[PDB]
Design an enzyme around this catalytic site. Structure first.
Site, PDB file in Angstrom:
ATOM      1  NE  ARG B  23      18.170 -91.846  28.072  1.00 44.42           N
ATOM      2  CZ  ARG B  23      19.257 -91.119  27.814  1.00 44.42           C
ATOM      3  NH1 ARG B  23      20.414 -91.365  28.415  1.00 44.42           N
ATOM      4  NH2 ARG B  23      19.175 -90.125  26.939  1.00 44.42           N
ATOM      5  CD  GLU B  60      21.061 -75.580  22.587  1.00 48.83           C
ATOM      6  OE1 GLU B  60      21.583 -75.230  23.659  1.00 48.83           O
ATOM      7  OE2 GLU B  60      21.122 -76.750  22.169  1.00 48.83           O
ATOM      8  CD1 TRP B  82      18.208 -77.865  20.217  1.00 46.30           C
ATOM      9  CD2 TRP B  82      16.924 -79.175  21.498  1.00 46.30           C
ATOM     10  NE1 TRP B  82      18.519 -77.602  21.528  1.00 46.30           N
ATOM     11  CE2 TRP B  82      17.747 -78.395  22.337  1.00 46.30           C
ATOM     12  CE3 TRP B  82      16.031 -80.083  22.080  1.00 46.30           C
ATOM     13  CZ2 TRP B  82      17.702 -78.489  23.724  1.00 46.30           C
ATOM     14  CZ3 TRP B  82      15.990 -80.179  23.453  1.00 46.30           C
ATOM     15  CH2 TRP B  82      16.823 -79.385  24.263  1.00 46.30           C
ATOM     16  CE1 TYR B 146      16.900 -77.289  30.095  1.00 46.23           C
ATOM     17  CE2 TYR B 146      17.269 -78.084  27.856  1.00 46.23           C
ATOM     18  CZ  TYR B 146      17.440 -78.214  29.226  1.00 46.23           C
ATOM     19  OH  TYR B 146      18.200 -79.245  29.723  1.00 46.23           O
ATOM     20  NE  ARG B 178      19.025 -64.875  52.220  1.00 48.64           N
ATOM     21  CZ  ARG B 178      19.249 -64.181  53.331  1.00 48.64           C
ATOM     22  NH1 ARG B 178      20.483 -63.847  53.676  1.00 48.64           N
ATOM     23  NH2 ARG B 178      18.232 -63.835  54.108  1.00 48.64           N
ATOM     24  NE  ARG B 179      12.461 -64.931  48.807  1.00 49.60           N
ATOM     25  CZ  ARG B 179      11.763 -64.768  49.930  1.00 49.60           C
ATOM     26  NH1 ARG B 179      12.272 -65.111  51.113  1.00 49.60           N
ATOM     27  NH2 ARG B 179      10.550 -64.231  49.869  1.00 49.60           N
ATOM     28  CB  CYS B 198      20.483 -82.306  30.711  1.00 51.51           C
ATOM     29  SG  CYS B 198      20.786 -84.006  30.131  1.00 51.51           S
ATOM     30  NE  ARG B 218      17.629 -84.910  34.264  1.00 48.30           N
ATOM     31  CZ  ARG B 218      17.971 -85.966  33.539  1.00 48.30           C
ATOM     32  NH1 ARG B 218      18.765 -86.897  34.050  1.00 48.30           N
ATOM     33  NH2 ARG B 218      17.491 -86.114  32.316  1.00 48.30           N
ATOM     34  CG  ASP B 221      28.782 -86.861  26.919  1.00 48.38           C
ATOM     35  OD1 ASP B 221      30.023 -86.704  26.964  1.00 48.38           O
ATOM     36  OD2 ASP B 221      28.220 -87.599  26.087  1.00 48.38           O
TER      37      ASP B 221
END
Ligand code: UMP
Ligand code: UMP
Lengths: 316, 316
Positions: B23, B60, B82, B146, B178-179, B198, B218, B221
């Site tokens: 994009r 941050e 931001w 976040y 494990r959760r 991200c 996901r 850079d």
């Protein structure tokens, strides 16, 4: 060989694996963080080192693809993978009248006579869900499970979101989207849930006309779990690619807590002495293209010549 | 060396990387599926091959830890990371009266005079958010970001869920869970969002008294993004471990679409010719233990002796 990564995973756990306790009263040898990939254009990653029932895989995946959350569908295909959870709801009900089926599963391993009693109670349950429509609607419906998460994600305003549906559309209209994610994990449910999704999240990716998919699995049973898990997803990658008219790429399996229960050591060891064989091949109905309407007759697994099956006690 | 994995990642992308469009109008060389880990007991993975501002990272992360979604906090620490997103909301507003700041960022690269105009409009904005409490409340608040995802996940019934808060509690009362997942990805928001997270999801793990953390990203850079991303999370692993009184383990970074924009080729190449140096060390205030109340003065980075910084054009 294609399944080599699995065997690699198994050995690694047998070496670098550290004994870690868990909720299922059985010791485990775990590993945190692991990634393996399968080039799907080389074959379908169904284990040849031990016979893995592709039938159970195919029907369970279709169950999800339909957005179905009711056990009835599964039972009418001789798939009992999800019985345990629905049965619990039944036995803990006030409408339930019969022998105290508490801590069953654990109680079955340690009580042969009780086991036959328990197995008989179950036989009743399955029968009624398959016949009594009200009972099925009342006790066969799991509610929060992959199909409803994948296709009926309840919005904070009554609505429902078809995650998979939109993603597949996004893949066609925007193949290069780095946002092609479907999530099974919902914070509101997670605390109020019997079994929060083991298959937490997955992402599609498109490049050179080939479709790849990556799965993040927070918890995995190396022996009994992983073989079915690799299958369900390598298939889903094929299914979505078939619809979108794309070639198939790789299936990337990323793990959180990969673990081998201590009662499967001997079995995994034996399987390890076996030499893999050429991978089977998938064949999907060329005419039919909308995967949501698919049926058993549409997915064919050619040349699967596995080794004998391996019996191992489920951990619970 | 500790940062070797990063450099490894960079080279791999330069070789196996395939040109893929995106994009942000600039070609990229991507890779799908990659995992790297850092043993935190060997050092803090802040890049020594190029000076990386730990200050921006620290402030941050604290912004997130507080559950703050307002830019004001960031601005009062000279952190403009931001700004862009909040500024958009401002310029697209009816209350906004000034030069047409459309497609800015892209428009800045291609228009020096306009750039000074744009940079002046921004200077105004930052000032007002820092002083005009109503304006800050009206234009400084990002809303879905976040901090609100991590600590104020809105339930489908008015409520709000403090994901991080409960997880940290679960780590103390059930270390072997494990959760232990916190998810930033919400299907309802994702379509109606400027920039879907991200940093999609992360998982904690406890074994032998050491706390490890894995992050699923996901999109990344390689050049400008990854250095800060490794920092924010290796730190968070430390922070949570500090609170829970656990040792620090590994930070596992799993990628979806790892990509290098074509305009950073020369820069990444130059950085690659550099030899890493010993890793810095983290020092956290031993008295103070509740990480949510932490402040800049609490996190110390000893012995960070980086190489010179590398200027590279942001892609947009
Ligand atoms: O196909 C499946 C289904 C479940 N699990 C496993 C992972 C664990 O063995 C157990 C779940 O443990 P928890 O993490 O939820 O506690 O079920 C798999 O690996 N594969
Ligand atoms: O710290 C950060 C913040 C953002 N991104 C990047 C990833 C992509 O370069 C761009 C987002 O692209 P989309 O996937 O959302 O389209 O921002 C990072 O890698 N690191």
């Amino acid at each position: 060989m294609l399944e080599q990564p699995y065997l690699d995973l198994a050995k690694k756990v047998l070496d670098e694996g550290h004994f870690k306790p868990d909720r299922t009263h059985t010791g485990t040898y775990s590993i945190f963080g692991h990634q393996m990939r399968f080039d799907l254009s080389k074959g379908f990653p169904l284990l040849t080192t031990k016979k893995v029932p592709f039938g159970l895989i195919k029907s369970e995946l279709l169950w999800f693809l339909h957005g179905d959350t009711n056990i009835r569908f599964l039972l009418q295909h001789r798939n009992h993978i999800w019985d345990e959870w629905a049965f619990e709801k039944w036995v803990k009900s006030d409408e339930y009248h019969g022998p105290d089926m508490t801590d069953f599963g654990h109680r079955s391993q340690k009580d042969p006579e009780f086991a036959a009693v328990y197995h008989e109670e179950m036989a009743k349950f399955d029968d009624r869900v398959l016949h009594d429509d009200a009972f099925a609607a009342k006790y066969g419906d799991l509610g929060l499970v992959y199909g409803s998460q994948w296709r009926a994600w309840h919005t904070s305003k009554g609505d429902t979101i078809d995650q998979l549906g939109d993603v597949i559309e996004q893949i066609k209209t925007h193949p290069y989207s780095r946002r092609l994610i479907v999530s099974a994990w919902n914070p509101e449910d997670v605390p109020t849930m019997a079994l929060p999704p083991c298959h937490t999240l997955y992402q599609f990716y498109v490049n050179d006309g080939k479709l790849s998919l990556q799965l993040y699995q927070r918890s995995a049973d190396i022996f009994l779990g992983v073989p079915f898990d690799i299958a369900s997803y390598a298939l889903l990658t094929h299914l979505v690619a078939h619809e979108c008219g794309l070639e198939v790429g790789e299936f990337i399996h990323t793990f959180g807590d990969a673990h081998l229960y201590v009662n499967h050591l001997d079995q995994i060891k034996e399987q390890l002495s076996r030499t893999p064989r050429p991978a089977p091949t998938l064949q999907l109905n060329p005419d039919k293209h909308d995967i949501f309407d698919f049926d058993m007759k549409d997915i064919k697994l050619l040349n699967y010549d596995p080794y004998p099956a391996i019996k191992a006690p489920v951990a619970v």
